[PDB]
Amino acid sequence: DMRNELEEMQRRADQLADESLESTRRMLQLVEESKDAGIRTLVMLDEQGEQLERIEEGMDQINKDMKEAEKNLTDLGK
Amino acid sequence: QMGCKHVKGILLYGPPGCGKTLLARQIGKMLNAREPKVVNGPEILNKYVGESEANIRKLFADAEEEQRRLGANSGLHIIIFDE
Numbered sequence: 350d351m352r353n354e355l356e357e358m359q360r361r362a363d364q365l366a367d368e369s370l371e372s373t374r375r376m377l378q379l380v381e382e383s384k385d386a387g388i389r390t391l392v393m394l395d396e397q398g399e400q401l402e403r404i405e406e407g408m409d410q411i412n413k414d415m416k417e418a419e420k421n422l423t424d425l426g427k
Numbered sequence: 428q429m430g431c432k433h434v435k436g437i438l439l440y441g442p443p444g445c446g447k448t449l450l451a452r453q454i455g456k457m458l459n460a461r462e463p464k465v466v467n468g469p470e471i472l473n474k475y476v477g478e479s480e481a482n483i484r485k486l487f488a489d490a491e492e493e494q495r496r497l498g499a500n501s502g503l504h505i506i507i508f509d510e
């Protein structure tokens with residue numbers, strides 16, 4: 350009558366982490382810095398676009414003025 | 428000069444209700460040192476793998492650090508294992 354039976358106990362392997370808290374924090378800090386740099390680039394790019402738009406009008410005005418002056422001088426000369 | 432090594436463990440036993448816990452707590456009160464660390468026995472076991480050993484080593488971490496810091500002129504640390 351040496352017929353034995355058993356029961357079982359369970360253990361849980363550690364969840365997936367303990368490497369997600371050293372590279373993670375550095376990743377977040379770098380992401381924040383990149384976000385700030387992107388915001389600054391946004392602002393600078395908008396300012397540059399405004400300045401180019403401003404330049405356009407003066408360019409067109411000088412072109413028109415020179416063309417009209419040349420035509421007038423030619424007309425009077427002949 | 429003699430250079431003998433001190434004792435580092437005591438085992439109290441006897442029938443129930445004879446003063447073991449009372450004697451231990453009174454001895455703890457007598458000594459002037461860091462507040463003695465008390466373990467209740469079944470409180471070390473954890474379901475995650477490897478955490479029981481970490482819990483055990485957390486008991487001796489402070490004593491080892493103090494012994495390293497001061498050397499042979501360090502204080503005495505008392506540990507009580509109930510049950």
Ligand SMILES: Nc1ncnc2c1ncn2[C@@H]1O[C@H](COP(=O)(O)OP(=O)(O)OP(=O)(O)O)[C@@H](O)[C@H]1O
Pocket residue numbers: 442443444445446447448449450
């Ligand atoms: N020698 C004693 N003098 C005074 N009180 C005592 C003495 N021995 C036991 N007692 C009283 O017995 C009670 C319980 O004693 P204690 O807690 O030491 O039991 P124990 O030895 O730890 O028992 P167990 O085996 O259940 O852990 C306390 O109220 C304590 O005052």
